[PDB]
Every structure is written in C-alpha cells, then in structure tokens.
Amino acid sequence: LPDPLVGADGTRVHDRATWQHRRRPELLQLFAREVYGRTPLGRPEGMVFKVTTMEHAALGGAATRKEVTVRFGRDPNAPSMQLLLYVPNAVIARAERAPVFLGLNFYGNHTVHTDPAIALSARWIPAEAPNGANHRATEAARGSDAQKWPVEQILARGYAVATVYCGDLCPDRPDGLNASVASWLDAAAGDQRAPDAWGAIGVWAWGLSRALDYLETDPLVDASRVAVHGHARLGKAALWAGAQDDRFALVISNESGCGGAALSKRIHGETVARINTVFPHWFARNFRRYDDHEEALPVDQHELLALVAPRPLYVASAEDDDWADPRGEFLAVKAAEPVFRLFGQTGPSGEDVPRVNEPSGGALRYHIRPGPHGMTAQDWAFYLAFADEWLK
Ligand SMILES: O=C(OCc1ccccc1)[C@H]1O[C@H](O)[C@H](O)[C@@H](O)[C@@H]1O
Ligand SMILES: O=C(O)[C@H]1O[C@H](O)[C@H](O)[C@@H](O)[C@@H]1O
Ligand SMILES: [Cl-]
Ligand SMILES: [Mg+2]
C-alpha cells in the first residue's frame, strides 16, 4: 500500500497540520483525477428549496414528514432531486433540533416505508426494483426496500431520517450520465466525457452534499450532527461525499466493497476491470487505466477512509459477501488507522478481522456480521449505538 503518511513527493507526514493542509488535498486530487472523477462545482448558485408537502402527524403521529424539491438552478428545467425527511416529534416537542441520518436509496423514496403519502418517484427505476413495471414506480413498490430502512426505529432512537433516490441525480444504468446532473453541465454524451470527469458515484456524492445544504436551513434538524450512510454502491457514494465535505459529522459505509472501503490491490472478489466493464458510468474513465493493472494505482481505498479523519467513520462487512472482500475492507480500516491515531483516535484492536457481531474500534470502527450481502437490523443497531456515542 502507498503509505497515507508519506506524501506523493516522498515527504513524511509527522504532524496534524501537514496532514490537513498538504496530504489531504493531495489525496483528494488523486481520487478525483484517477478514481471518481473531478467534482466540477460545489453548491450551485441559484439552487432553490421548495417544501412540497409537510405533515406533522405522519406515522401515527410519531413524526413530521417533509418532502422537499431541491432544484439545482433557477431555470425551471434545471435538474432537481426529491428529499424525503422524517423528524421525530418527541425531539421537536422538547424544543430540540434532531441529529440526522442521511443516505441515498436504491429504488425510490416510496420504497423506504409503506407510508402511502410518500410521492411515488416519477423517475426511471432499474428492472431489479421490486414490484416495478416498465422501469417505473408502482403502488405495489411502496415499502419494498424497508428492510434496509428501519425508519420508525431510527426515529424512536431520536434521529431524523433523510433520503433521496440516487436516480434523481444519476440514473443507475450504463448510459445514465446522459440524463443527469452531469449532462446538465456537460453536453458530452457517453464516453465523450473527459477522462477525469465525474461519473455516477461523484454525482450521487454531490447530491448528498446538496441535501446537507437543505438541512442547514431546516429549523427542525441539527445540520452539524448528520451521519451520512450508504449501502454497497451507495456506500461508495457516502464515503466520497464524506471525504469531500467535512461538514458531515460521521460517515458509515455498509458493505461498500470495490472502489469503496475494500482494498483494490488485493484482487479479491470484484476487481477494477470487472467493476468498470459492468458499471462503466460509476467511475472516471481514468479509473479504467487500472483494469487488470491495480499495481499502478497511486492510491488505495485506505486513503479514502483516511480522508474522513478525524471524524468518526464506521466501515462494515458481511461474512458471506465475498464480492465485497470483507477482509479487504477490514485491512483498509487498519491501513487508514495510523492517520486516525495521528489525531488521537483509535481503530480496531489487534490485527485480524474481529469475531462476527463484535464491533471493534473507537472513532474508527469496524464490524463484520454473519450472512449474505445486505443491510440488517444488526448493522443498524451497531450504527445507532455509534451515533449515540458520537452525535452528542
Ligand atoms: O448490468 C448493467 O449493465 C451491464 C452493461 C450493459 C451494457 C454495457 C455495459 C454494461 C446495469 O444493470 C443495472 O441497470 C444497474 O443499475 C447498472 O448499474 C448496471 O450497469
Ligand atoms: O451496490 C451493490 O449492491 C453492489 O452491486 C454489485 O455487486 C457491484 O458489483 C458492487 O460493487 C456493488 O457494491
Ligand atoms: Cl433500536
Ligand atoms: Mg475486490
């Protein structure tokens, strides 16, 4: 592995200021140029927030539900995304602003809960979407992804729940960038995009920061206590959003795998060539230089993990998710751990993967659970306990 504490010019990093002001920028530029693609703008001038629905007694009175259209320019044809937010009414009643879990969803806001008041998504949805007809949402799709989205449990634990359909931002399909935030800004289609131009993971990540922009204006939530989380490909997005945007208070990667938390140079499970051929829209075209050539990579994913430091970072695996390379995810955490310890934070104790269902580490935390790829109640219990400790 490239040593996170040795700079690209061979300079060894021995102090927190050099990490922050020299090594971090260096790593951000390398991930942007060679891996994810460059994010071509931050907050758009002229972005508009419009609350389209609000219900103070949603979920049997447990929560206030808002839907917010976030439009990225004043042009009414500019792209937008639809933010679903649930705020726990008990917290509101104590005249307190709730901390927030924020993450993208795979198949639409209407899939995170059966709640029939959620607007069905009008956007293209992938064929794998349960109860989807002709790539469009259907009433039968309501709550179809609830397993990954314990909304009422999260609310009962004192957190707001914010989500956006990843396909509002970039449709998850090999040509999706052609109708996305990226094509709003860049008339190039397909593989005419610049080699260092962002792909779907960068667009998804950017959307998470725009959601945080909205949350900073919502009087019901505390935008300085946002945990950004994602599962699998959306966990890749959560990692890159949290690395680019240090406003996020805590980052959670649930089984994000190749190009997320897993070491690429391990060549275990999904490889760089495989991921770029199946998902040519996810990464920068420059990342294809490393197809069957991971040895030339100037970074590996322990350095993306390290870009969260010293903020709390939870990486987790599933024992039978070999395609994600669970031990490669653990070793990325261990290889990032020296940067966290530079800031006085600690990672997993000892040098090999902990027993299943036994989290290990302080602000840099890891667990592996039994079972197949997924996001389970046990995963969520561990994440909520982590947030309880780190979000005041
Ligand atoms: O398997 C897929 O593409 C395979 C492929 C086909 C033609 C050219 C290149 C690759 C897509 O399947 C779903 O649409 C997923 O949401 C999306 O991420 C995947 O790329
Ligand atoms: O998003 C998911 O569930 C996963 O889908 C595929 O398995 C892909 O190869 C993984 O990289 C991704 O993380
Ligand atoms: Cl619980
Ligand atoms: Mg792998």
Residue numbers in the entry: 36 to 427
Can you list sentences taken from the study reporting this PDB entry?
GEs belong to the α/β-hydrolase superfamily and possess a catalytic triad common with serine-type hydrolases. OtCE15A is an interesting member of CE15 and the α/β-hydrolase superfamily in that it features acidic residues at both the canonical and noncanonical positions (Glu-290 and Asp-356). Here, we have investigated by mutagenesis the residues involved in catalysis and carbohydrate binding in the enzyme OtCE15A and, furthermore, present a series of structures of OtCE15A with different ligands, including monosaccharides and, for the first time in CE15, di- and oligosaccharides.
To investigate the substrate binding in OtCE15A, we sought to obtain complex structures of the catalytically impaired S267A enzyme variant with GlcA and the model substrate BnzGlcA, respectively. However, we were able to obtain a structure with GlcA bound in both active sites (for this particular complex, a crystal form with two molecules in the asymmetric units was used) and an additional BnzGlcA molecule near one of the active sites. The substrate molecule is located along the edge of the active site cleft, making only one hydrogen bond between its C3 hydroxyl and the carboxylate of Asp-207. In both OtCE15A and MZ0003, having the arginine in the active state likely aids in driving the forward cleavage reaction too efficiently to allow trapping of the Michalis complex even in the absence of the catalytic serine.
